[PDB]
Amino acid sequence: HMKDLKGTKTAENLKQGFIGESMANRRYLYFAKRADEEGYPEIAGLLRSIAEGETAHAFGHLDFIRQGGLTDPATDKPIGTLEQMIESAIAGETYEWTQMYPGFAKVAREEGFPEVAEWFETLARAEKSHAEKFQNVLKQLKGGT
């Protein structure tokens, strides 16, 4: 019979699958740039085509998560409706600019890595801008205009 995914090992395996598939697409597109520079177009093309595979895998994991009423792997927020999706976006961006990247920057400065700290501070300011743009979308959706 049909069962709730909530609290199951399968729910956790969909989450972990999503994380790994997300990383695989980013990794393969980064590796493709090195193949591009070095003159390996067949290798770059394969990396890019396999990366599209990993997009399909990630999106299918999110399909089962959303259809199963499970939460966003990144934020533990529901992602059933577009409004919920934007609220998930806002929650993650808010965590990143208010807590995560400032904390990473402080640790980098304290460990003697000022260039890395500056990068984390650039990202904190970027995620704040993202949060603001998503907040404006949510106003448009929630207000129905």
**Per the annotation, where are the binding residues for Fe(3+)?**
21, 54, 57, 93, 96, 127, 130
Q: Which of residues 20-79 bind a second copy (CB under 8 A)?
A: 20-31, 33-35, 38, 40, 42-43, 46-47, 50, 53, 55, 57-60, 62, 64, 68, 72-74, 79
Task: Identify which of 17, 7, 8, 11 has the alpha carbon closest to the alpha carbon of residue 67.
Answer: 11
CB atoms within 10 A of CB 119: 15
The 8-class DSSP code of residue 72 comes to P
What track of x and - describes contact with Cl ion for positions 62 through 81 (by CB under 5 A)?
Answer: --------------------
Residue 42, φ and ψ in degrees, nearest 5:
-70, -40
Binding status of residue 119 toward a second copy by CB under 8 A: yes
CB 114 within 8 A of CB 101: no
Considering beta carbons, is residue 69 or 100 the nearer one to Mn ion?
A: 100
**Residue 82 three-state SS:** helix
Residue from 41, 48, 71, 89 binding a second copy (CB under 8 A): 89
Please report, as residue ranges, which positions from 84 to 113 form the binding site for Mn ion (by CB under 5 A): 93
C-beta of residue 101 within 8 angstroms of C-beta of residue 123: yes
**Which residues here bind Cl ion, judged by CB under 5 A?**
40, 42-43
**Which residues here bind Mn ion, judged by CB under 5 A?**
21, 54, 57, 93, 127, 130
